[PDB]
Structure formats: structure tokens, C-alpha cells
């Protein structure tokens, strides 16, 4: 089991695994799209990739915002939460 892993495993808090993962990354190099991420590269050929924007906060009278979040959610978690989507726009 490689560093990243590890690391991951042992420090489910971003703000811990980012700790540990700088006290030993050999390169650091950042992704602007989307959430945007972090991402620390190990001697072992491994890597740590955290996202920038785990997070979203929906006002429910909004369509824009209801919107954003349906857009923030990965695919799956979309399919999951359409009718909740819908439901919410349609009460807005
Ligand atoms: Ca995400």
C-alpha cells in the first residue's frame, strides 16, 4: 500500500491529510477547473488529490442555485437526486 493510500486511510479530515501529505510531497501542483484541486505527488509514485470545493450551500428559492447544485454533484449523486432536483425547481 502506496503513501497516498495511507495517508488517505489514516486521515479522512482534508485539513489532517493535508498536513501529512506536505510534510513529505516531493511536488505539489494545482487543477483551476472545476472544484479545483490539489494534488501532492509521493516518492512512491503515488498521489494525493484533494478537492477545493467539497462543499455546496443551496438557497431552496433560487433556480440558479438549485441549478449549481445539480451541477456540483458527480453523475451518480445527480441520477440520485433528479426528482429532488425537479421538485425543487418546480417550487420555485
Ligand atoms: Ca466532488
Known amino acids: 500500500t502506496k503513501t497516498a493510500q495511507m495517508?488517505?486511510?489514516?486521515?479522512?479530515?482534508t485539513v489532517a491529510a493535508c498536513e501529512?501529505?506536505?510534510?513529505?510531497?516531493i511536488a505539489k501542483d494545482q487543477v483551476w477547473d472545476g472544484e479545483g484541486?490539489?494534488?501532492?505527488?509521493?516518492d512512491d509514485n503515488?498521489?494525493?488529490i484533494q478537492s477545493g470545493t467539497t462543499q455546496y450551500a443551496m438557497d431552496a428559492d433560487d433556480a440558479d442555485?438549485?441549478?449549481?447544485y445539480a451541477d456540483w454533484l458527480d453523475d451518480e449523486a445527480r441520477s440520485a437526486e433528479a426528482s429532488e432536483i425537479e421538485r425543487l425547481l418546480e417550487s420555485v
Open 7 to 13: 495517508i488517505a486511510q489514516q486521515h479522512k479530515d
Open 20 to 25: 501529512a501529505a506536505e510534510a513529505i510531497a
Open 37 to 42: 484541486y490539489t494534488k501532492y505527488t509521493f
Open 46 to 48: 503515488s498521489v494525493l
Open 65 to 68: 442555485s438549485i441549478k449549481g
